[PDB]
């Protein structure tokens, strides 16, 4: 039987990978960060409250100018906010109201959204007609589209619930690259700062690091006991943090190919919806199902602070590119800006 | 105050957007959101045609009441990752064919379509997001179940069934088996209706169940529920 021999070879390769990870570990992150000063208590106050959504907010994305937001709620509305003045720049009605994710282009010219319609819709913000119109609808995913991230004005990587990540060309609307290898539904997506690699967390309790231009999984990261819902690179792009339903956040290294630290507390039993890093990467902000966001010392696994003030589950998180503020979206149809 | 002309005009645009969002929300609040569920293509299609690729939107109006019926078929994914999107639906319309009690699911060995429907109903009814959501259970294809129960007894599906091979007693037993999966009888109620291939009163039954749900929502809004 060749299948039994190949299963044995796969088990041997997994054992070799585990042994390499174990022998490559000498001193944990906690053991070397215990000699550095803690961040103390991080106190953040709600500076702005963005009202206007009438259903649960499922996703957000900050602009690269650190002032413009896009939010997605089950109203079927993509609202673009001026976070400084709490002004609604745009209100984009969606054909399908079952939106799970929204992205904002780095140039600021486009927004994306998607969800249970299995379609990533690109919207042109800066048109000559003065309205926001659908640039195109990206079809080809057979499951719900759970995350999308713009690479540039013409490239976008979409996470989906068909256990598949996809890279798209927005001029042609075609499937440029398909990323396969996940067993469970891919729920999260994060692009590297150089936008050469990206990580995706799925429902198989596994995180995979992909190469955009090669279309293959380079490394696979395990350690979670439940479905990974959130993922985010470290600001230098050498590490990333995941958030899952087991009330634990893990930090993984790309170069060490191993988990570095777990961010869990005994009083936390609910799942984690969103994971974001501060500008320096010292603070790890995680949104939970128990209605508040917990700030974590990313180097010491210490609860630096709590962002409480949402009456429902905090579904989405985002730190501005200048690190000035963090915005929390929640199922109570509200967005809050914290400093 | 301390705003420029362009700032004031942007604020006015934001206020126009706020108003338009408010009429959109008021229009959406009067619509009835229905989640259509069932094991495979059993009775969803005939129900949809009687009322009127990811999620399918079905719109129909009955007695000046607009209905939004969502079909989550062909969404072969983990339900728990997207079933919370329908937490605020008015009711769940569950379609179960009555004639697939002896059929095999053809996906697993020794797998029964009726038991698959029963486990799907158990997962949906006892879901954490549908604790207070009423279920309009439809037992479809009662004519085929009429004409095929004589040839094939129901005991091949339920070994504990000891009743006679009559349509009324077996249909009552089937409805009792489906309603026994409700572990939250103190906070939700299950509406069971038997539909033929061409049944006209299904829309009226849905309207009555939705009206009961709307009465309950009105009472909890006024503090009586």
């Amino acid at each position, epitope marked *: 039987s060749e299948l039994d021999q190949l299963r044995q070879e796969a088990e041997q390769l997994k054992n070799q990978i585990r042994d390499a990870r174990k022998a490559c570990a000498d001193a944990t992150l906690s053991q070397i960060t215990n000699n550095i000063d803690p961040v103390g208590r991080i106190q953040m106050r709600t500076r702005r409250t963005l009202r206007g959504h009438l259903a649960k907010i499922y996703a957000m994305h900050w602009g690269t100018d650190s002032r413009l937001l896009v939010s997605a709620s089950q109203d079927g509305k993509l609202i673009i906010w001026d976070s400084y003045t709490t002004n609604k*720049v745009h209100a984009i009605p969606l054909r399908s109201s079952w939106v799970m994710t929204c992205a904002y282009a780095p140039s600021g010219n486009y927004v994306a959204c998607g969800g249970l319609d299995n379609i990533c819709s690109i919207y042109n913000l800066k048109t000559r007609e*003065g*309205n926001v119109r659908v640039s195109r609808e990206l079809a080809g995913h057979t499951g719900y589209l759970s995350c999308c991230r713009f690479l540039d004005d013409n490239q976008i990587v979409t996470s989906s619930g068909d256990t598949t990540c996809a890279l798209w060309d927005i001029e042609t609307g075609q499937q440029t690259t398909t990323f396969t290898g996940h067993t469970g539904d891919v729920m999260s997506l994060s692009l590297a700062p150089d936008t050469r690699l990206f990580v995706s967390g799925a429902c198989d309790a596994s995180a995979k690091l992909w190469d955009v231009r090669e279309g293959m999984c380079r490394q696979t990261f395990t350690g979670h006991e439940s479905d990974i819902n959130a993922i985010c690179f470290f600001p230098n792009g050498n590490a990333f943090a995941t958030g899952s339903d087991d009330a634990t956040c893990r930090l993984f290294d790309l170069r060490a190919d191993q988990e570095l630290m777990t961010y869990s507390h005994d009083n936390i039993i609910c799942g984690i919806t969103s994971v974001s890093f501060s500008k320096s990467g010292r603070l790890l902000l995680a949104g939970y199902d128990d209605f508040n966001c917990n700030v974590w010392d990313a180097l010491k696994a210490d609860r630096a602070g709590v962002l409480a003030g949402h009456d429902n589950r905090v579904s989405c998180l985002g730190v501005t590119d200048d690190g000035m503020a963090v915005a929390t979206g929640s199922w109570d149809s509200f967005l809050k800006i914290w400093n | 105050c301390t705003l*420029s002309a362009e700032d004031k*005009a942007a604020v006015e645009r934001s206020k*126009m957007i706020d108003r338009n969002l408010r009429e959109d929300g008021e229009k959406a609040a009067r619509e009835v959101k229905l989640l259509l569920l069932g094991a495979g293509e059993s009775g969803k299609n005939t129900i949809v045609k009687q009322m009127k690729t990811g999620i399918v939107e079905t719109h129909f109006t009955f007695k000046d009441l607009h209905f939004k019926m969502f079909d989550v078929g062909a969404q072969r994914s983990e339900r728990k990752k997207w079933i919370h999107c329908f937490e605020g639906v008015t009711a769940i319309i569950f379609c179960v064919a009555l004639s697939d009690y002896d059929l095999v699911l053809a996906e697993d060995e020794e797998m029964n379509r009726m038991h698959a429907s029963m486990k799907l109903f158990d997962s949906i009814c006892n879901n954490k997001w549908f604790t207070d959501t009423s279920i309009i259970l439809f037992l479809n294809k009662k004519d085929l179940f009429e004409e095929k129960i004589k040839k094939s007894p129901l005991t091949i599906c339920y070994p504990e069934y000891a009743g006679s091979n009559t349509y009324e007693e077996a249909a009552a037993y089937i409805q009792c088996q489906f309603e026994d999966l409700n572990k939250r009888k103190d906070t939700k109620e299950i509406y069971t209706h038997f539909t033929c291939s061409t049944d006209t009163k299904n829309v009226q039954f849905v309207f009555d169940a939705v009206t009961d749900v709307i009465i309950k929502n009105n009472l909890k809004d006024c503090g009586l529920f």
Partner: single-chain antibody
Amino acid sequence: DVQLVESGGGLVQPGGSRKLSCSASGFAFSSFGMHWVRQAPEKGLEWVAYISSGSGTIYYADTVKGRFTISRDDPKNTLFLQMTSLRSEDTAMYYCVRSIYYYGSSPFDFWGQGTTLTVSSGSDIVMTQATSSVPVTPGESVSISCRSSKSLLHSNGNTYLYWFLQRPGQSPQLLIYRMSNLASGVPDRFSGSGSGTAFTLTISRLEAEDVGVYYCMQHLEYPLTFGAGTKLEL
């Protein structure tokens, strides 16, 4: 394409009443605030009236206030300028101007072709251009300077300075909308700069396509005031 077509102009006896229409096509007319800007035969842009989106805000110039009426009908995409008691100083070519206002928007971006109407026989921000007509060699850089009585820099960091180029026999177009921001469809050889009350507009590698009259307009507060107009010759 975006198009604004004006109508209703003509020869008018003094004290008469005429109504101007501005048919809009190719853009979402309802979401745009709309301006009327007239230009007398002495070649000077002058703002007349403004109506916001939804008709909630209406402003008039002090010389037409209570005497002109601006209105819009969004179902048929038409902008109206109901004028009564027309006097000889109202003899101008009236431009219907398209402007939208949000964060990062580009108001005054599209101007209509203009309709010509002929009449027979203190606290405002003064916008100043020192040079009214200067000759320029093609292929060489030129600078057009503008000054304002009040500082156009606001507390929010925006300097509300607009640069318009009006080629001979053509409607004005927007080049720079907030003192530095290049407009859409205009070449990168146009650059704007300045601070406070002093402003400049640099055109490196000038071509014959840039020949015209250059206007500086403020949008800090109503009424919107233009410069006298710097004309480039040769």
